[PDB]
């Protein structure tokens, strides 16, 4: 059971950018998903979760009117969608989910991407 | 969310950290989770839903509930326990709040 | 108006044995024995362990001709089919095992 | 053995994927499955306890198994084989009949969870719901998402639907 | 170079189980050695769609 | 421990000689015993795998455990002899547990089995019979071999039955 | 695991200090606490046969671990740590795992009895008391201490407080 | 458990004889009772069987109305009785029954005899 | 019931025997049974119910019910698995057909 | 769990005694105390016993009337009390209960106090 | 309450004490118990409930009820067994009378 990420670089301020998770090992429609950053100094600050069924997504105070997650199940995918980024949202970005014995457990996240460098700079 | 900016723990010994809420009670229905990350690697889970420990976490990692927050104890810290600790705690199901990590050092 | 009861099932091929029942196919599994070793001699406890190519622990010992090819301290000692290089003059070499026991594992 | 797992229940759901064990409704409103989240999480931290007992208490300890005789020390060679042999069969057997406890002791907790999961919601329904057999409850009053909310919590208000199921029974 | 606490004479073994299948001479805190072929451990339910 | 054998049913059967678990019926065309054919081939199933588990787990392999040495070797021979009884206790305790664990499960899941019978027959009749308490049902309905085969075989019609049976309630 | 102890009934009683498993009656004559001995005595020879069973199948030896050699002997030393290690390693292992299993079954062992008495207790009083769901019965039909005596017993006489339950029922 | 056969020999062709098999070990009231024949070359033949209350007796095509099985619970002994003997029924001649555990089985035949030889020539 | 006359193996191979009626299909309820038999001894039962091995039988005999014909696997077969092997086929409770014998030969 | 007698000696025949018996390791509220005598040269005679609850007390016949039994469970006391005392009560007296696995066992006394001597004597 | 006044064993051997009353049967309800003294120590719990032994009661002790009277049967008579052994048989649950005492000797 494996998440890698990818979609990360470089991106203007101001701009948009599209990351995406690819799970192994396991299904997506038998998992949620959660998108949670951390600064390069600084803590973990959680962005947003996909439910199991896909119906219901949460996002937090600072990714509420930007930020849209979805997912795929049939390519076993799930998306982060980053619009008007500022400067603020340089960080290095995470999937994370919780599964124990081949099930979901929604408020765990033990499963953990490597995780992807978002820089975003005007110069 | 709030935690203790660092602590410091000596070989063999045990220690506590705290997470508790701003403006309110830390109780089982928020699931207090908590997180070791070394700064070049991917968080891990150690503790969940307060008490339950995932399988390949060393028995020396507690959780529990006291007054009103959470605690997490480490009794017979070894040199590889020198981190970074989260928690998190929950609102509703899929709603999820960090706190400000605690830099726990081995001396 | 309907309540059912039920349980989860997937499309696992796992399987388990019981000793009631073999071959009994589950939705998840942990396996308690490993069979894959990495084909790779390496480090024990930190310290590389003392490789004789040619030689053997006689050999090295009495310092033969064909070892000057060859650490102040070691985890084991690893030799080789064809460590044929030792006593090079015939005679015997007494309590060689217990030598070759005493100088397994140097600090 | 209980007799719900591969019994009164005769089989699992693919469609749910929210936990092991839970409920499936159908209303008026829609049908739908839902887990149970507590059995489910306490089924999950004891299989983890059962895992945890398993791994973590063989206490093992630095060694050097092989050892080197020369050919006047043969019986010693042989003592050594038969300890070797003796550990490796003891192990072996221990193993083996270890493994094949725990797995029907796990099985018989998942049907037992089941089961218990059953008898508390037709404790808690009594005689305003029919036992078809199959592991359902229909209900002899029509209630909505709050009431099979309620059953799945565990607060059903028998005495409220009392009189509406009288009339239909 | 590596770091192993389990060596045998074809390769290093990752001492987080409890049994081995390897090899039976060993150097370090070794899993124990047993003479079998699968040896898995039941944690979910059985599969019956 | 489920209270069938040594519980609510007090006793055992010796004419029923054709199984292990079964039926004793009585009609107006004569009274029998049926035993049950799946219930008792699946126990001999499990059974048969369980002591085939207890024997052939045990993996021999060839063994000289005699050794001989001289008088000047004591400290050897009392090394031996320390192997020797070290063996010898480990697998007499393991020995005398597992039989005595695996009495415990055997009896058991007879016990289960019958219980398990019994609650199948209990469910399909519902209020169409009465429990007299011992492990029988009367029926409220007059029915043949005909109707007694279906319940044994577990095709039994409750609606076809119900109205007749609701009369004599 | 059966869904008594820490289940349907939800805690143990303090009061109750003649027994392990018992009866709580409340009739106008009063309120009070029975053990039922039977079970108990029961239980209490069970878990003392499975102590005696841990305890008394050791069947030790006299011997003297400690042995004496010189610097030229490390070999042979080895040999006898190893023999050592692996002793200490199989009794921790066994040791730790039988305690483990057997605190479990005897836990279910308790949960069995609790819920057999409960059942036992349920098919004797049958539809003449009201099932609250706590583990307790409101009886339909005012009886005495005579009653419950033979409710504790085995001796109910249902025929006799039918009728007298069907009114109020 | 054991079963031993007796009675068999050389019999004229046309003739009759009467193969006796014993049971030692368990009651033949709790048990089945099967006849098979096999020819010296050739494979294994079902003649019949008698079931364990001894109601229902079930023959095989070349057998029936030739040959009859009884069984005495009471001596623990099954009898098959030849009345038709012809040139064909020289064989190898088994007793044999389904116990597992203790009880019976009708499908299966675990439990055999050492069988008994008839011959049937006119030589 | 068909059999095949005769097949062959090699030691430490596997083999697969077949039944099969001649006018219809093999289910469960027939109950198929595998016989081993020895020129000089009465016959030995191997499996029963298409699953069932009894106590004492050695675990490379397995059963199964492929497509429409009953089937006798042995996996790492020896040289004391040289023998005839007779299939039986139930029609009711004590009805039953033998099938011809199928003569195996380890090599 | 143990008991332990005190309050014997020298008496008066005629006169009276009091004997307490202490517990520890157990309450009082849960369990039953009996009380016995063993003469110096013959065997054990029961003298009476007091209930889990203390509302039932049975003596027997050579006590009945004389010997009283009290038992005060917050001190996690029991005291016997004898009147009218004869040269035939020179004896060892002991208070028994019976434990088992934490419960009362009213027909078992396996719980025994070392004793007390009691020696009534007009010299 | 009636016991004999003494019996003899031999080391190894098997003996069966006899408790009786004077004027009735003995059964289950009376719940004969048995008592094993040394002269300076307080009794011992052997035998409760006809047939139960106390954890820590060697297992040669057994008892049960034999016509109209309760035994206790000593099999494997050692040296330690040389003591004397009473008999208690209950009328109701608290009233309880016990015979005189059975000096058992070893020889």
């Known amino acids: 059971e494996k998440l890698v990420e990818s979609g990360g670089g470089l991106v203007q301020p101001g701009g948009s950018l599209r990351l995406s998770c690819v799970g192994s090992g396991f299904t997506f429609s038998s998992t949620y998903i959660g998108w949670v950053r951390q600064a390069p100094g600084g803590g973990l600050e959680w962005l947003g979760s996909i439910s199991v069924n896909g119906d219901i997504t949460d996002y937090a105070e600072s990714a509420e009117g930007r930020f849209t997650i979805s997912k795929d199940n049939s390519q076993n995918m799930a998306w982060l969608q980053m619009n008007s980024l500022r400067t603020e949202d340089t960080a290095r970005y995470y999937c994370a989910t919780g599964r124990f014995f081949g099930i979901v457990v929604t408020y765990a996240m033990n499963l953990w991407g490597p995780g992807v460098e978002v820089v975003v700079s005007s110069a | 969310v709030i935690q203790e900016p660092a602590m410091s723990v000596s070989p063999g010994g045990t220690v506590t950290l705290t997470c508790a809420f701003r403006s309110g009670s830390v109780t089982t229905s928020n699931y207090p989770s908590w997180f070791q990350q070394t700064p070049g690697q991917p968080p891990r889970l150690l503790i969940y839903n307060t008490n339950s420990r995932p399988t390949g976490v060393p028995s020396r990692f507690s959780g529990r509930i006291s007054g009103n927050k959470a605690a997490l104890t480490i009794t017979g810290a070894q040199t590889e326990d020198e981190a970074d600790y989260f928690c998190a705690l929950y609102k509703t199901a899929l709603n999820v709040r960090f706190g400000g990590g605690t830099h726990l050092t081995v001396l | ?107 | ?169 | ?49």
């Open chain 5, 1 to 49: 170079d590596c770091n192993t606490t389990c060596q045998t004479p074809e390769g290093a073994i990752n001492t987080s189980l409890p049994f081995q299948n390897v090899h039976p001479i060993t150097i370090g805190k070794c899993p124990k050695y047993v003479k079998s072929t699968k040896l898995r451990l039941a944690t979910g339910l059985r599969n019956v769609p």
């Open chain 3, 1 to 107: 108006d309907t309540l059912c009861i039920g349980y989860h099932a997937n499309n696992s091929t796992d399987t388990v044995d019981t000793v009631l029942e073999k071959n009994v196919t589950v939705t998840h599994s942990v396996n308690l024995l490993e069979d894959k070793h990495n084909g790779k001699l390496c480090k024990l406890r930190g310290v590389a362990p003392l490789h004789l190519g040619k030689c053997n622990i006689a050999g090295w010992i009495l310092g033969n001709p064909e070892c000057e090819s060859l650490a102040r301290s070691w985890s084991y000692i690893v030799e080789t089919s064809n460590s044929d290089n030792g006593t090079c003059y015939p005679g015997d070499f007494i309590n060689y095992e217990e030598l070759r026991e005493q100088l397994s594992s140097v600090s």
């Open chain 4, 1 to 169: 053995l209980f007799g719900a797992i591969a019994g009164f229940i005769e089989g699992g759901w693919t469609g749910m994927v929210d936990g092991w064990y839970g409920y499936h409704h159908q209303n008026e409103q829609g049908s739908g499955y839902a887990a149970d989240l507590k059995s489910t999480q306490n089924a999950i931290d004891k299989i983890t306890n059962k895992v945890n007992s398993v791994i973590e208490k063989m206490n093992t300890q630095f060694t050097a198994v092989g050892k080197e005789f020369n050919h006047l020390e043969k019986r010693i060679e042989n003592l050594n084989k038969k300890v070797d042999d003796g550990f490796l069969d003891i192990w072996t057997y221990n193993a083996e009949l270890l493994v094949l406890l725990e797995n029907e002791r796990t099985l018989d907790y998942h049907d037992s969870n089941v089961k218990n999961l059953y008898e508390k919601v037709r404790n808690q329904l009594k005689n305003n719901a029919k036992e078809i057999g199959n592991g359902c409850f229909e209900f002899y009053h029509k209630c909505d998402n709050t009431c099979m909310e309620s059953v799945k919590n565990g607060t059903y208000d028998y005495p409220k639907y009392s009189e509406e199921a009288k009339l239909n029974r």
